[PDB]
Scaffold this active site. Structure first.
Site, short mmCIF file in Angstrom:
data_model
loop_
_atom_site.label_atom_id
_atom_site.label_comp_id
_atom_site.label_asym_id
_atom_site.label_seq_id
_atom_site.Cartn_x
_atom_site.Cartn_y
_atom_site.Cartn_z
N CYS B 98 0.83 -1.21 0.00
CA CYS B 98 0.00 0.00 0.00
C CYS B 98 0.86 1.26 0.00
CB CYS B 98 -0.93 -0.01 1.22
SG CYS B 98 -0.11 -0.24 2.83
N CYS B 150 11.01 -13.06 -2.39
CA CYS B 150 12.40 -13.19 -1.98
C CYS B 150 12.64 -14.60 -1.43
CB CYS B 150 12.75 -12.16 -0.91
SG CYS B 150 12.42 -10.41 -1.31
N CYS B 217 -10.92 -42.05 24.46
CA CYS B 217 -12.30 -41.63 24.72
C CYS B 217 -13.25 -42.03 23.59
CB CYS B 217 -12.31 -40.11 24.93
SG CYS B 217 -11.34 -39.20 23.63
N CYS B 288 27.45 2.52 14.69
CA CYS B 288 27.34 3.16 16.00
C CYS B 288 26.89 4.62 15.95
CB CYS B 288 28.68 3.07 16.74
SG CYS B 288 29.26 1.38 16.97
N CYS B 293 34.22 12.18 19.38
CA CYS B 293 34.52 13.37 18.62
C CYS B 293 36.03 13.59 18.56
CB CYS B 293 33.83 14.62 19.22
SG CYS B 293 34.06 16.10 18.19
N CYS B 298 39.59 18.09 21.69
CA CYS B 298 38.28 17.78 22.24
C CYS B 298 38.34 16.51 23.08
CB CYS B 298 37.25 17.67 21.10
SG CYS B 298 35.58 17.26 21.61
ZN LIG Z 1 33.27 17.72 18.62
ZN LIG Z 2 0.80 -1.33 4.07
ZN LIG Z 3 -9.62 -39.09 22.72
ZN LIG Z 4 12.05 -9.08 0.05
#
Ligand SMILES: [Zn+2]
Ligand SMILES: [Zn+2]
Ligand SMILES: [Zn+2]
Ligand SMILES: [Zn+2]
Ligand SMILES: [Zn+2]
Ligand SMILES: [Zn+2]
Ligand SMILES: [Zn+2]
Ligand SMILES: [Zn+2]
EC number: 2.3.2.31
Lengths: 154, 322, 76, 76
Positions: B98, B150, B217, B288, B293, B298
């Site tokens: 959709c 797929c 049964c 990650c 930095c 720094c």
């Molecule tokens: Zn920085």
């Molecule tokens: Zn959808």
């Molecule tokens: Zn049974």
């Molecule tokens: Zn796929």
């Protein structure tokens, strides 16, 4: 609800762009699921008449596909007496979620214009179309003018 | 939120997931990770991420991951079901069924990578569940593949079907448990509301639901036909028609538009961000979100999506990229 | 009322229906528990085909009765 | 927490039990509910058998988690 989200995008596309052969698209405002349309055959011997179809898209859509039910008698060995064309693309065992309905109509009208007796339903019609190509032509001339709908004006 | 979890008590829906890691043997929050990881493939497998356990009578190097519910506060025996496939729809990809952009989105494990809005996934499992069109594996279970087309692309997680719910998943457990028995080598008994898996002799045609209190049964049924027992035969069987090979019809255009990485490629600027403290471009290398930095001046730990300095909430809520 | 239904390859079941109820309803119920399309269900009783519109009262079926369900395996 | 002890034949028991409560406690409680002793009852959870000393903690089971109950048969 979900199919209504699906089909209003498609209905605006198919009416605007236009399928040319497929004409007279009677679709309801509230009842979005039923689509009726008049297919125009171009190949002999179906272009003598014209055939109406009513595609009933179900509650679960588009996970299950709809049944393209004809409201027309057509002389063609895939389709049966009542109104059930045999279509490879509309299948449960083989189906894709992302199916366009005009893609199914491209499947349907090519199926209508080019008769398949390799995967048919009716036995004597598939027997006749394979064996006697003239007689299936001659009966289809007599049948489709009698039973099928008129040719349009455009 | 990168981590979503399913919470029994009292959420009953896909919540945020607060990721924490603990020691294998002692099981505390006193762990030294060597690396602090890249993906759910690290976190899902037992004994992958390894480091150094702090609290000092404990030489178990390997650690254990556990997800908790990120909305209302919890205690230690809470362990929520980690939803590893389903992330937020950050790149803003449509659904393949959709043409709709919704959050969050499921990502199936398939090669080109196919994603989906949530409400379709309720529909896709149940229409397959009603019809019975799943793919049963010996090892993994009774799951669905990728929807587009797929091969070898099943979800490796029964607990994801808990998004369908306690009604549907329990019904999924009954139909799944039935699905194993034919592949193992059994038949379901035809007495109304019994379902007895019984093993008689090879020679004896007449097999009976026999047990006593449970199981057996009062039903003697014929082996071939499953009727009330008789001497002779029943009527003939129907012709079978083999499918054998089935080229699964995939849509070209919609499969392009249902791709998690691209479809149309909205997220372009996600490579180098200006750090606040320094004011320098730094590159994001791989998974990650936690980035150092990397300056002589720094030295500072900051999160990629947040920007502010790296804390345990930014560790817990969204550690890595999805 | 309790009725048994039979299949091509062995597996016989039951289903809870009435005299009044519809075969399209009962195929929906067998579609619920068994896992087959109403499109691919061929119910036969006493050398006779069971219609979706037609019902168990018309065909005249009591409890302790078997329905012969032939399967459609090419649904196309 | 509610558990569904789903037996092989049909019927399933609902029981209020903790992680803390053991199988020997639940074999008492199922004996209370249905009326079958510890020695007859055999609990299994997806292949692996449930034993008397081990518990819902060791086997690791939650609310809405389906166990199976197999019955031992005495005197043939
Ligand atoms: Zn920085
Ligand atoms: Zn959808
Ligand atoms: Zn049974
Ligand atoms: Zn796929
Ligand atoms: Zn919660
Ligand atoms: Zn430790
Ligand atoms: Zn018989
Ligand atoms: Zn943050």
């Amino acid at each position: 609800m979900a199919a209504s989200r699906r089909l209003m995008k498609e209905l605006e596309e198919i009416r605007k762009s236009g399928m040319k052969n497929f004409r007279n698209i009677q679709v309801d405002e509230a009842n979005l699921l039923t689509w009726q349309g008049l297919i125009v055959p171009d190949n002999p011997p179906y272009d003598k008449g014209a055939f109406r179809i009513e595609i009933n898209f179900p509650a679960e859509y588009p996970f299950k596909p709809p049944k393209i039910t004809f409201k027309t008698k057509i002389y063609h060995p895939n389709i049966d007496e009542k109104g059930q064309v045999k279509l490879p693309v509309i299948s449960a065992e083989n189906w894709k979620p992302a199916t366009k309905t005009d893609q199914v109509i491209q499947s349907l009208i090519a199926l209508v214009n080019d008769p398949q007796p390799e995967h048919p339903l009716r036995a004597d019609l598939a027997e006749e179309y394979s064996k006697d190509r003239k007689k299936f032509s001659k009966n289809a001339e007599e049948f489709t003018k009698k039973y099928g709908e008129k040719r349009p004006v455009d | 939120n990168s981590f979503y979890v399913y919470c029994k008590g009292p959420c009953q829906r896909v919540q945020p997931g607060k990721l924490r890691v603990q020691c294998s043997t002692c099981r505390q929050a006193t762990l030294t990770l060597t690396q602090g990881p890249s993906c759910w493939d690290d976190v899902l497998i037992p004994n992958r991420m390894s480091g150094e356990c702090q609290s000092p009578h404990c030489p178990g190097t390997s650690a254990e991951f556990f997800f908790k519910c990120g909305a209302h506060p919890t205690s230690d025996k809470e362990t929520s079901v980690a939803l590893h496939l389903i992330a937020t729809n950050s790149r803003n990809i449509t659904c393949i069924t959709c043409t709709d952009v919704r959050s969050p989105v499921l990502v199936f494990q398939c090669n080109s990578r196919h994603v989906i809005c949530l409400d379709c996934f309720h529909l896709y499992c149940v229409t397959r569940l009603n019809d019975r069109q799943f793919v049963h594996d010996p090892q993994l279970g009774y799951s669905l593949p990728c929807v587009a087309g797929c091969p070898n692309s099943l979800i490796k997680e029964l607990h994801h079907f808990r998004i369908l719910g306690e009604e549907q998943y329990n019904r999924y457990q009954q139909y799944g448990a039935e699905e194993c028995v034919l592949q193992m080598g059994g038949v379901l008994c035809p007495r109304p509301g019994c379902g007895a898996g019984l093993l008689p002799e090879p020679d004896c045609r007449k097999v009976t639901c026999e047990g006593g209190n449970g199981l057996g049964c009062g039903f003697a049924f014929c082996r071939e036909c499953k009727e009330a027992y008789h001497e002779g035969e029943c009527s003939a069987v129907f012709e079978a028609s083999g499918t054998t090979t089935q080229a699964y019809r995939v849509d070209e255009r919609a499969a392009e538009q249902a791709r998690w990485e691209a479809a149309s490629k909205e997220t372009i600027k996600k490579t180098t961000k200006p750090c606040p403290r320094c004011h320098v471009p730094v590159e994001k290398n791989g998974g990650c979100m936690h980035m150092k930095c990397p300056q002589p001046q720094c030295r500072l730990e900051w999160c990629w999506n947040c920007g502010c300095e790296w804390n345990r909430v930014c560790m817990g809520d969204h550690w890595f990229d999805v | 009322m309790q009725i048994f239904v039979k299949t091509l390859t062995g597996k016989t079941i039951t289903l809870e229906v009435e005299p009044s109820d519809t075969i399209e309803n009962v195929k929906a119920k067998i579609q619920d528990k068994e896992g087959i399309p109403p499109d691919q269900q061929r119910l036969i009783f006493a050398g006779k085909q069971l219609e979706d519109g037609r019902t168990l009262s018309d065909y005249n079926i009591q409890k302790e009765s078997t329905l012969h369900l032939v399967l459609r395996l090419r649904g196309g």
